[PDB]
């Protein structure tokens, strides 16, 4: 499904302004991932498109991605930044990431990726210690945990440079953010919902950012750092 | 009703993300447009936060807006852009712009507008003749008639620079692709739908732009000039 009113309206967007003219690598990678069990987590085609646009408009060169899985967001990012662009990609799994690496290599853009297996927080905390790392990223995409976003934000905010833009994914958490107090939902969406709601409030009240909640994909809250 | 799944989901977006850090008077100017005698149509609360973010992101200074009325997206652009640059607030035909100019003046940002009246189609053709007005606008939002988009795009594409970004409101026309010839839709919509459907197919194929169709309010197609 999607966050729109109908599955046909959403499809219309895909069939008319997304699929036609979409590199191909995305087409491939999207096929590889379709056979994988947890394919429900893969970023949507329209959201990959929005990221591509966004990345181009802000001339992002140096970026970071938390939550890689298979590689869709990554691929999109690597194809959008310049030939000398760099991406610090973090994910706890890694078998998954290599499932799509063949494609990224076939698209000849795997050279921009610096993959690091393991939990993101530790690594983040380490970067924070070196002052030269502060404000060194143009773009940071967070599509991981959820019950860890607020924690990421604490340090991501000093690592994003004023230029800004930090993207939090699934901010509308399958609409469960306004679901009827009596319509049981899957155990995990029920769990992460308290976190997302919590995340949203903190974000809407953070003086250091700008924020915009786009209902593309499962919702991305785009944060522009102002200081 | 919006384009999202529910009305609550849409409100959740406005309650938490918009109204809180919403700009000053955007609520004034929006409660003014509610006083308008014709009520005519859609005045989305989320376009402001979106336009604001997009403009600061692309660092727009020299902008142009075609299609005012009250000036809600105009106020946004005026407040969002810097005190420096100006907004060639192209025009509209009626003076509903008058109906809202006091707020855009009260928020001391009107000193950036260059409002004009009567069809812009002429002004553009005139602007084009000079081989310098070519690619001088950093951003152009078009919320004009509807059947004139295609026509505007013709000239408009020569006036924006590299990224440029041309935006077209209602490009999703409250739900274009509805049930085939058996939908109880007001003739007024079906009439304009046609232009939209074609405005979309056309923009989707133009090889000088990248485009991205966002479900913000009534749909906004962001275009990025590449050639
Ligand atoms: C960063 O990456 C990440 C991303 C994500 C993204 C998650 C997403 O969901 S985004 C969306 C992607 N996939 C999807 O689009 C959706 C997946 N599944 C569905 O949509 C889906 O078809 C469905 C949720 C299972 C169906 O829900 P539903 O709304 O159709 O059904 P329901 O539960 O409300 O059923 C209600 C009715 O069912 C009947 N019912 C009664 N008991 C039951 C029951 N135990 N089960 C089912 N139906 C029941 C009753 O008639 C009930 O009505 P009433 O009047 O309350 O008695 C997670 C991470 O963990 C990450 O890390
Ligand atoms: N603490 C943590 N640190 C790093 N990665 C984590 C993590 N907790 C979960 N993850 C990972 O976050 C991943 C993101 S899945 C969604 C994003 C992906 N770029 C796509 O578009 O397909 C999960 O697959 C999981 O392995
Ligand atoms: N030729 C034209 N030029 C400019 N505005 C026009 C127009 N024809 C109609 N309009 C007005 O354009 C209105 C849409 S205004 C859409 C809202 C958006 N926030 C914005 O302010 O840009 C119509 O309701 C109508 O009354
Ligand atoms: Ca996601
Ligand atoms: Ca409109």
From Swiss-Prot, chains A, B:
Swiss-Prot/TrEMBL GO biological process terms: lignin biosynthetic process; methylation
Keyword Plastid (UniProt): no
Catalytic activity: (E)-caffeoyl-CoA + S-adenosyl-L-methionine = (E)-feruloyl-CoA + S-adenosyl-L-homocysteine + H(+)
Cofactor(s) needed for function: Ca(2+); Mg(2+); Zn(2+)
Pfam families named in the record: Methyltransf_3
Top EC group: transferase
Pathway info: Aromatic compound metabolism; phenylpropanoid biosynthesis
Binding site for substrate: 1, 143, 174
MF terms in GO: caffeoyl-CoA O-methyltransferase activity; metal ion binding
Function: Methylates caffeoyl-CoA to feruloyl-CoA and 5-hydroxyferuloyl-CoA to sinapoyl-CoA. Plays a role in the synthesis of feruloylated polysaccharides. Involved in the reinforcement of the plant cell wall. Also involved in the responding to wounding or pathogen challenge by the increased formation of cell wall-bound ferulic acid polymers.
The name this protein goes by in its record: Caffeoyl-CoA O-methyltransferase
Gene name per UniProt: CCOMT
